[PDB]
Ligand binder design. Structure first.
Ligand code: HEM
Ligand code: HEM
Ligand code: 1ED
Ligand code: 1ED
Lengths: 394, 394
């Protein structure tokens, strides 16, 4: 006698478990047990993943309902699960989106100078260097401080919330509330700070005093600050870190991109496709009875959309484990999701990785792991897969 | 068909696997496979563990022989496996031992003041706090700087080697050689530095110029510095960290020790007994054919002495999972080993933990985990079991 198949399979972000392909071939939608003890439908083929993400009756918002089967415990207030919905309803979608495009004057140059400075310091200190704690994560943090319009010096303290904020836990986390309330207070103070006139918080601060936004709550304005910092920094920091592992392990690709840096955008799109940064399927709660492949999903049930299921599906991406810069469908991956909840920071995430990789290859063309790859320590029970340290030499 | 049982069982240091007791009862010496692919004899009862540790024909030195079955790859030069042997042969055993006793004038007071300062800063910053990175590890580091007689400011950089130096790896680690050579250079410089006149390095520095030690190599003198810093800091830092977890999870004991701090030494001895800080059995290579229980161990074979096997053996420590302050045999545990290779820093390790715990309970009587205990991230493929962060509130 065995127990129901449990998720997640492995916290390692350097290889995809064989079970994924076995599941996709034989049972692309199937029952599993989450860390909370709830049952869920795990969906692992490109066709069925897209079907779920494109049908709003599979609701993100409703995952926060009391009594629902849960993937993990909330680390934010239940209303914050509908964060983008709330922003849209407040008439703030356009303003937020304009504030987070990588095409802001001087922003890409700021990224370049920042990446270059970080790398110069590592070279000066000498090998080994930690490319997560001393490159990818400070770069992500520096970027989001600039995008938000908040002091660079405040970045490290806001960052220190994230190892807890993005936990994937069976039970509520007392520290998450403490940090959340503190960070919300920080952002409420930013909105009242006359020095803060640029970036996303500068724009929110002015819209807050505009009579057309008079009935938008101060709670929402502070929430947008905390949530976009946290989601942007964890996503870009983790993606860049795991992408660098994928590159370091592919010297031929590394040499090609070094030689022809104009191929970097196509390289990053493939790195996105094969990336295992997301530790759990994307959760949705059925709000009707809906047929998904061989299964009738019932109202109230939890569905988990497995991004690497879709992104490694050989029916959509032939030879899926190989980085190939000349695919006919290169942006059709699900790394940024699909449908109603498509990542609003996708352009910014792309540019973050492109510039980070550009600068690394320029400065450290001899980059290699300083420890055997099995020695990386993979963070557990977290919403992302990431090594605690990424030791490299050059 | 199944493969040979693999070690280690789990990197979690907050619970002992059920398999340990099952092994001890049914097969207290049995064949296993290590991470290198080698076979070894795993020994898990108190009686057989003591037998192996007390018989020098089970050699520590010989584990470093070329072609031997290995638990893991060397992170030090092969001659350094015989470090204490080398010290003894150089006539330096007494001098080293005298230098590392916790009874040095002002040393315990330095520990108290240091622990108190660290805790005050955490209280000032506010919850949550990380008791590994911001308490146990700086306290261990501060202590060993003082014991060695080296600047407190040099501690953090020497510490940064340890996440690699004490890896338990299948293959050699390039970063370990880089850090090793650099740290050896640092210590060679300390021996020539006229400012360094106290502690272990001050004493080695004077013995180096004494004609009775004229033919002791400079290599050995620098090696003693690097090895005692590294082993002392990793062992005390890791033990204190995991001991604090054991305490936090036992509020009744925590209250008793708070109320009657004179019981702390007896508390620490039990915390040592139940501690799971050591990630692997202690390795020994047979140099003869020797009967151990039902098995004839052959010359050249690897034997792994499982400390928690012995320390949780109900035949020697009845109700072994319970901390009981009134045992008749309280120091007969194997936390510091046994025989030829008994830990030379045992008194210092005891005092480090006693003072750290004393100060914590005084300052933070309300200490508790700030995250569910399953959320701790346990370091993998390492010679110690430790959480990457220990978030607490008070
Ligand atoms: C390469 C980096 C990034 C990756 C891989 C990524 C991935 C994703 C994915 C897969 C989703 C969809 C989740 C779902 O449908 O359940 C999402 C949504 C979201 N992301 Fe990103 N993201 C990245 C960067 C960013 C950045 C830079 C920001 C903001 C600065 C951001 C903020 C958000 C927000 C607020 C949502 C929720 C959207 C909604 O609910 O409609 N992300 N992200
Ligand atoms: C509570 C903290 C400590 C624990 C739990 C601990 C544990 C141990 C154990 C179990 C051994 C025996 C290994 C074997 O036989 O294979 C050992 C040996 C050793 N320890 Fe400790 N130790 C601690 C503190 C220290 C300190 C503070 C120092 C130095 C400052 C130190 C330096 C050494 C050295 C050099 C050896 C090798 C002894 C030999 O080969 O004869 N340890 N330790
Ligand atoms: O639940 C949500 N919360 C935030 C993201 C977020 C989560 C935790 C945190 O501490 C800060 C920010 C959101 O905007 N949208 C949704 C979905 C989401 C979760 C995680 C990352 C991105 C989106
Ligand atoms: O192999 C040894 N090396 C050192 C300990 C040591 C290991 C690694 C390092 O980077 C620094 C110090 C020793 O003294 N004795 C032996 C056994 C030992 C290993 C680990 C801890 C304690 C003792």
């Amino acid at each position: 006698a065995t127990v129901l198949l449990e998720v997640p399979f492995s916290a390692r972000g350097d290889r995809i478990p064989d079970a994924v392909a076995e599941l996709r071939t034989r049972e692309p939608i199937r029952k599993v047990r989450t860390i909370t003890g709830a049952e869920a439908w795990l969906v692992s083929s490109y066709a069925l993943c897209t079907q779920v993400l494109e049908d709003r009756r599979f609701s993100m918002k409703e995952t926060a309902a009391a009594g629902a089967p849960r993937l993990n415990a909330l680390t934010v207030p239940p209303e914050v699960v509908n964060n983008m919905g709330n922003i849209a309803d407040a008439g703030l979608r356009k303003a937020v989106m304009k504030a987070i495009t990588p095409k802001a004057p001087g922003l890409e140059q700021f990224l370049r100078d920042t990446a270059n400075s970080l790398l110069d310091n590592l070279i000066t200190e000498g090998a080994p260097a930690d490319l997560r704690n001393d490159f990818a994560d400070p770069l992500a943090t520096a970027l989001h401080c600039k995008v938000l319009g908040i002091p660079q010096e405040d970045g490290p303290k806001l960052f220190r919330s994230l190892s807890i904020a993005f936990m994937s836990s069976a039970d509520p986390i007392p520290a998450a509330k403490i940090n959340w309330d503190r960070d919300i207070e920080y952002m409420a103070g930013i909105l009242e700070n006359p020095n803060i006139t640029t970036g996303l918080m500068g724009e929110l601060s002015r819209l807050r005093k505009d009579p057309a936004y008079s009935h938008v709550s101060d709670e929402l304005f502070a929430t947008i600050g905390v949530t976009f910092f946290g989601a942007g920094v964890i996503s870009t920091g983790s993606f860049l870190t795991t992408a660098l592992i994928s590159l370091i392990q592919r010297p031929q690709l590394r040499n090609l991109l070094h030689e022809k840096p104009e191929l970097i955008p196509a390289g990053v799109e493939e790195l996105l496709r094969i990336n295992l940064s997301f530790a759990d399927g994307l959760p949705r709660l059925a709000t009707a009875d809906i047929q998904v492949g061989d299964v009738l999903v019932r109202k109230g049930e939890l569905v988990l959309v497995l991004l690497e299921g879709a992104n490694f599906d050989p029916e959509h991406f032939p030879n899926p484990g190989s980085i190939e810069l000349d695919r006919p469908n290169p942006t059709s991956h699900l790394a940024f999701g699909r449908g109603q909840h498509f990542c609003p920071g996708s352009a910014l995430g792309r540019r973050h990785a492109q510039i980070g990789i550009e600068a690394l290859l320029k400065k450290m063309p001899g980059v290699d792991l300083a420890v055997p790859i099995d020695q990386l320590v993979w963070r557990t029970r977290f919403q992302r897969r990431i090594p605690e340290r990424l030791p490299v030499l050059w």
